[model samples]
Target chain A: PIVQNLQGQMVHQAISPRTLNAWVKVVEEKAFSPEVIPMFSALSEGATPQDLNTMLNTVGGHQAAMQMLKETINEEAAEWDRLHPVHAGPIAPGQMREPRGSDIAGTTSTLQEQIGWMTHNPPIPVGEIYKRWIILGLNKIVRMYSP
Target chain B: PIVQNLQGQMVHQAISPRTLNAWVKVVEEKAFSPEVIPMFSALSEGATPQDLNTMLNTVGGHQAAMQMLKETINEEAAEWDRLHPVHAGPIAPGQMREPRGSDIAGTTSTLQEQIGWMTHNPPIPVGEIYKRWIILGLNKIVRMYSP
Candidate 1:
């Protein structure tokens, strides 16, 4: 269900989060650059109007159309970590905790259900909601289990 | 002129090289990370058919998009380096070169002229071509020059 919401978010972000997720998975599997971690982090954090404008006017701006892209990937990564426990570690450089399976599952399922609702609803832009969740939900989650 | 030809190339590349370039610039200005460098390089070098599909379908695929983006930025960076002789250095890391004024002027002039042409020609897609060019081109240039 969370996957569904994620899918909806991906689409609302651009075309389809499913496609974007698929792409993120491939990058993680093949390239696996640590640099992406921070990049993804910054994008999920959101951009300012000036940042957006500058991006619009720069070379990176052209590609910035994919801004939703990093957010989508980060969402997926967090979900993946939740679904697969081994991926879990310190939320930061000096923190560590094992999240309850129930919590992770619940969170994932809730997100997925939201995605499904959006998908079935069709044509509605679910990205705006997802953006809020990322900033709010993920931030809370990270803080609760702060590294 | 070269701008016209380049414009054609941008269109053929799908969603205007300029747009792609602009996206690249945004990423660079925001300091998305250096990891995007190789990804862009791979796209410019032209990936294999299989690789291409994988790139398109996966998060890593964004790299291919990034690669096309890198090419656009790199081209502009090279141009600027030539024109602005005082600022010649590696456009991106590990990419050093001497300032070549003619190439820079020629390329800039070409792109400027092509933009003018697009204004007058008003392709069926209307502003699409110019929009894409500006976005993609700026993105790429920003990445190469690092701000």
Candidate 2:
């Protein structure tokens, strides 16, 4: 019912693991291990996102909770790097999909043009908690044999 | 493209922490602690689904990996019981949503009817590799537009 991309995938601005970790990485840069990090540390083995939320509120306040979400993005990015093999080409392994949105929609831009664009990007904030996003994706059963 | 519910949300059948535990529980009834569970234990503080998959194959073959995947489901179910409010209901909280796939061409079945049907169903095997299912979700920014 909502808007969807050309691919028919619903376009929901999703604040997810990748973005969350990248945002947190940015913050953790300026302020080492903000109060939120320790709270995450306190969680027992095998913590779910729901557990993450409870930890956010219990360990610190919601603002700090926001930071933790940002922090999640940072962690995911690092993981991506560990997974993918990088070539000598332009894109870094971590950058391939983290906060993976970027484009001249409906058209592919030239390399020279993209280079100029990236070289002069105005300002991109950390995948802010926290806003205008939450990536929700589902997978359905794919069956065969139509009689 | 694919089918949509009345809500128009795209339908995707996903196996997640919940389903994984339930399936594992079922298998464990016959065979105990398949090899995969231990590999999961090997993961450090943070690990991803890809990590789990790689660990699955590396630790044991896919069959054993499947068992480990099933094993995961059991652990999560136990955790869910610890979280949700339990009542006089026959089904435990964890079982409420795990292994939860039902229906045809997509339609609603009421709680009573659905429960009865679920009460008696044939053996359905696990959702297999692995394309269509993953326990992917996170909940962080719970605070809101409420000033």
Candidate 3:
């Protein structure tokens, strides 16, 4: 019996075309609302590292998604500030401080770093999916903090 | 006009007793399913660093949650193997490799490190809650890998 090295190489195999397509179909049918379908589709169709790197700057990529979320939150907060116009009195008496790009930079950077580790080191058997979940959770929080 | 330093200190205050309690209540009422409420409640009730350190090992703590998820997934997979008993053939033809403690150790350790940084450096305006999110995301992945 093989002891199963069970590491990064396993993760690469787990994200094989058939498995990714199965996951995508499950999400689509179940209304799971995953935002990485296009990426998965491209990968399934033989998108390479260069293609993924290019996608990183385009819409629907993780970096682009995160950047858009940050921009939206900041824009909403700025609009609120403009309309509310904090006067001499304490504005936002009970409201907590809003998150800024620098504020989330640590998280965002850590996420990128962790993804890098998973990709490079090849641990976490479902690395691709976990990476997706982590980003989705971040997306949820960004949406929660809207306005 | 204050530019709002808007960094780590804001995160500390965002996790202040009152704000934490408010968040806990909202989660409780709305069924948001955040797993960090006990930590929040403890912080609200004057739990010190030492108290939190002790709580980290107890039930409901982030570490405990992740560890439990990992253990459960492994146990279930082990049981499945016991019954199925792969022999002389390709077992799990389409199934992927299950995650192991070693496989997830990087994620679990990174989580701890990120939480430490949030506490120490104080960036990520919602540092406390986002730490919770990261852990929960890990938990979901661990569960997803169950055979």
Alpha-carbon runs more than 4 Å astray in model 3: A1-147, B1-15, B30-138, B141-147
TM-score of 2: 0.20
Taken over the whole model, the C-alpha lDDT of each candidate is 0.37, 0.31, 0.37
Clashing pairs in 3: A8-A122, B8-B122
TM-score of each: 0.22, 0.20, 0.19
Report how far residue A35 has shifted in candidate 1, in Å: 24
Docking class of 2: incorrect
What CA RMSD would you report for each candidate?
19.5, 21.7, 23.5
lDDT of 2 at B88: 55
**Model 3: how far residue B31 lies from native, Å:** 3.9
lDDT of 1 by residue, A1-147 (tens): 112233234322222223323344444464334444454344533222222222212222214323454455356546656666654444575433333322222333343343443455343323433444334443444444344
Rate residue B24 of model 3 by lDDT: 43
- In angstroms, the error of model 1 at B74 is 11
- Candidate 2 lDDT over A1-147, as tens digits, reads 022456654332222333333433444453333332343333222222332332232222234434544454444444544554455657765453222222221023333333333333452322222111221000000111112
Instruction: Name model 2 segments beyond 4 Å from true.
Output: A1-147, B1-61, B88-147
Worst 10 residues of 1 chain A by lDDT: A48-57
Give me the overall lDDT of model 1. 0.37
lDDT of 2 at A17: 32
